[PDB]
Amino acid sequence: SGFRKMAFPSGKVEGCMVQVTCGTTTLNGLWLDDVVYCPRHVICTSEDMLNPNYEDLLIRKSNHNFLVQAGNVQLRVIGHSMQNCVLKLKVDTANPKTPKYKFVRIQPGQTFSVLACYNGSPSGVYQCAMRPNFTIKGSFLNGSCGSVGFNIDYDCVSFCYMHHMELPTGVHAGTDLEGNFYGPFVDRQTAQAAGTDTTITVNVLAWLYAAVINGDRWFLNRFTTTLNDFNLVAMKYNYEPLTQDHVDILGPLSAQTGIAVLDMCASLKELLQNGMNGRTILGSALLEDEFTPFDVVRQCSGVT
Amino acid sequence: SGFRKMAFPSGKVEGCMVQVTCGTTTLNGLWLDDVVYCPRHVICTSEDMLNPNYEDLLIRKSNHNFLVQAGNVQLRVIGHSMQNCVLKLKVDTANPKTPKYKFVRIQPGQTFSVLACYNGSPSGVYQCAMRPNFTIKGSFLNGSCGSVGFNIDYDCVSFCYMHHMELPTGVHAGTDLEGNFYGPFVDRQTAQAAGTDTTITVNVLAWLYAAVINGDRWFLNRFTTTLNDFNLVAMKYNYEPLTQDHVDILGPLSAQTGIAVLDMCASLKELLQNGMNGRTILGSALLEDEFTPFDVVRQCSGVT
Numbered sequence: 001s002g003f004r005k006m007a008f009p010s011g012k013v014e015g016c017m018v019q020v021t022c023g024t025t026t027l028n029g030l031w032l033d034d035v036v037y038c039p040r041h042v043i044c045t046s047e048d049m050l051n052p053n054y055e056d057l058l059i060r061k062s063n064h065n066f067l068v069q070a071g072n073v074q075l076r077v078i079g080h081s082m083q084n085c086v087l088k089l090k091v092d093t094a095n096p097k098t099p100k101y102k103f104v105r106i107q108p109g110q111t112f113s114v115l116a117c118y119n120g121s122p123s124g125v126y127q128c129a130m131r132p133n134f135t136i137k138g139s140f141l142n143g144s145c146g147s148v149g150f151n152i153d154y155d156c157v158s159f160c161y162m163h164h165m166e167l168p169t170g171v172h173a174g175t176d177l178e179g180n181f182y183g184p185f186v187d188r189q190t191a192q193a194a195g196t197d198t199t200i201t202v203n204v205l206a207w208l209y210a211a212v213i214n215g216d217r218w219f220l221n222r223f224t225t226t227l228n229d230f231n232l233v234a235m236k237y238n239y240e241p242l243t244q245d246h247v248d249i250l251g252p253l254s255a256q257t258g259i260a261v262l263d264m265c266a267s268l269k270e271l272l273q274n275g276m277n278g279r280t281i282l283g284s285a286l287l288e289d290e291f292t293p294f295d296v297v298r299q300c301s302g303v304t
Numbered sequence: 305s306g307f308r309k310m311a312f313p314s315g316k317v318e319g320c321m322v323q324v325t326c327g328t329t330t331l332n333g334l335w336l337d338d339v340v341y342c343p344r345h346v347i348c349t350s351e352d353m354l355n356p357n358y359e360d361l362l363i364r365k366s367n368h369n370f371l372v373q374a375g376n377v378q379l380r381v382i383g384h385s386m387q388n389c390v391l392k393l394k395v396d397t398a399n400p401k402t403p404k405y406k407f408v409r410i411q412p413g414q415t416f417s418v419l420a421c422y423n424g425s426p427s428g429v430y431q432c433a434m435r436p437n438f439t440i441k442g443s444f445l446n447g448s449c450g451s452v453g454f455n456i457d458y459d460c461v462s463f464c465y466m467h468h469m470e471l472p473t474g475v476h477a478g479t480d481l482e483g484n485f486y487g488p489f490v491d492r493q494t495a496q497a498a499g500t501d502t503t504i505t506v507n508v509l510a511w512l513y514a515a516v517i518n519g520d521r522w523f524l525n526r527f528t529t530t531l532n533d534f535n536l537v538a539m540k541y542n543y544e545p546l547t548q549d550h551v552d553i554l555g556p557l558s559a560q561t562g563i564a565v566l567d568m569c570a571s572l573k574e575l576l577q578n579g580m581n582g583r584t585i586l587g588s589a590l591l592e593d594e595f596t597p598f599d600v601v602r603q604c605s606g607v608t
């Protein structure tokens with residue numbers, strides 16, 4: 001019993017973190033096989049960041065300008081290329097700690113673990129969601145760029161995020177491992193406002209199921225609703241609209257608890273309309289939206 | 305910017321987790337040098353748990369009854385001993401992944417990371433505090449016993465917790481790595497009620513500092529108070545009394561923010577007396593008490 005915001009074990013990714021230095025800019029890189037992945041803005045001074053031409057800036061760079069350090073040992077760079085907003089540094093040694101891994105571009109609502117690093121040394125791990133405005137609510141200080149987000153399925157690390165930018169509102173923007181930004185963000189020190197931070201409705205319902213499963217049941221009510229009725233309420237409270245796909249995805253938690261998804265929607269509706277009246281659910285005073293149905297099932301059935 | 309419930313990177317501890325099987329009971333063990341540490345109740349059937357005599361139960365056990373499996377490889381047990389409520393299994397091979405480590409018995413209010421394991425495989429990592437009633441609010445399913453809690457100082461893992469018991473109220477009890485329980489708990493399936501779950505006042509103030517540092521300042525007020533006055537309010541709301549030691553410990557956050565600890569106490573007092581009036585602090589609708597001053601300073605200054 002008990003329900004916790006839980007990150008994947010970070011070992012397999014700790015073994016991939018290196019320091020990348022170009023001139024006097026230092027940040028984190030990801031060493032997988034004989035390639036080191038890092039944000040392309042490693043080649044910028046903060047002067048450069050107001051309006052950089054990365055193609056022009058890169059022309060002044062050579063293999064030997066990219067200093068890569070795995071712990072204390074220096075890696076030899078035999079090639080560099082720009083892919084979208086990341087650099088790929090070909091090194092002459094395959095990382096012997098390379099896990100099985102994939103690159104995946106996640107959708108908003110999907111959750112992942114972040115290994116926050118400074119100078120290629122891991123400082124801590126925490127759980128995130130890709131927000132519906134394609135920001136993440138991270139914890140990232142100066143030098144944390146190149147820190148990566150990941151899921152682990154048994155032996156396989158799926159890398160979904162590389163950290164690039166803190167927006168002036170202290171939320172975070174970054175790329176998949178192909179260097180394509182999530183959302184409309186650019187690696188440029190400009191005006192970039194986040195859109196509406198909408199709540200991930202399907203994740204809140206998953207978390208309500210997690211609560212039922214763990215004893216917290218006070219918010220179960222006598223009522224039901226329809227997808228269309230629930231959605232009117234969702235709109236009013238800047239909740240993502242709930243689809244039949246969301247209902248389907250919640251089926252296993254439905255089945256296990258014996259609460260129809262549309263009954264749980266009616267419970268959520270009442271919570272949106274009445275607030276929690278000073279009570280808590282799984283030790284929280286608001287509605288948590290960064291547990292996926294998959295996260296709840298995993299944590300509620302002890303998957304490794 | 306941004307503030308997150310952050311666990312230590314779990315790699316160094318992932319490398320110490322093994323499966324311990326005695327008869328038909330399986331749980332997690334900690335492999336450090338040529339010793340495997342596990343809960344002594346590995347030798348019990350759940351029948352045994354109502355009123356076990358561990359000394360008598362152990363007499364029927366031999367080195368060869370303790371099956372230890374590190375991933376797929378079986379370790380050979382050349383010795384076993386009972387220390388308080390843990391077993392120490394002497395194996396014939398030192399763990400080549402042994403980090404630098406200490407055993408430390410933490411005090412209530414202190415926070416640590418838990419690597420939740422099943423069958424010696426890590427499932428996830430999360431942050432905890434030892435509560436003032438010597439419980440922790442974990443997330444632990446059947447087979448999670450022998451899971452350990454830890455802090456990391458640079459290269460050194462300080463192990464402070466081994467998971468033993470879920471109490472009937474779905475909170476968790478366990479031992480330091482010398483097998484001594486935190487609080488009055490016993491490895492026995494009996495009536496064991498938790499005491500008052502009091503809030504860790506010094507940790508809440510630390511978290512209020514973390515909030516100031518990160519932009520959330522709405523709860524700063526015009527008022528100050530005294531240790532004695534604040535403490536009257538603390539008593540009423542089941543907050544730990546605040547000592548001069550707590551004030552001293554908060555000095556660095558005081559200095560960095562320019563808010564006297566007694567001014568922040570007055571802010572907390574108003575929050576206790578008036579609630580948050582539907583507002584949030586660092587994305588939370590209640591007062592977080594499982595960040596230590598040391599945790600806030602660490603996360604706010606990018607320590608690795």
Ligand SMILES: *CC(=O)N(c1ccc(C)cc1)[C@@H]1C=CS(=O)(=O)C1
Pocket residue numbers: 024025026027041042044045046049141142143144145146164165
């Ligand atoms: C994002 C990041 O961590 N940094 C960074 C580097 C370069 C640019 C253009 C923006 C941001 C850190 C800033 C200075 S550093 O320590 O070299 C890395």
Ligand SMILES: *CC(=O)N(c1ccc(C)cc1)[C@@H]1C=CS(=O)(=O)C1
Pocket residue numbers: 328329330331345346348349350353445446447448449450468469
């Ligand atoms: C605590 C724990 O994880 N288990 C356990 C084992 C033995 C006793 C007496 C209590 C609790 C799990 C229960 C069954 S198991 O899978 O063998 C381990």
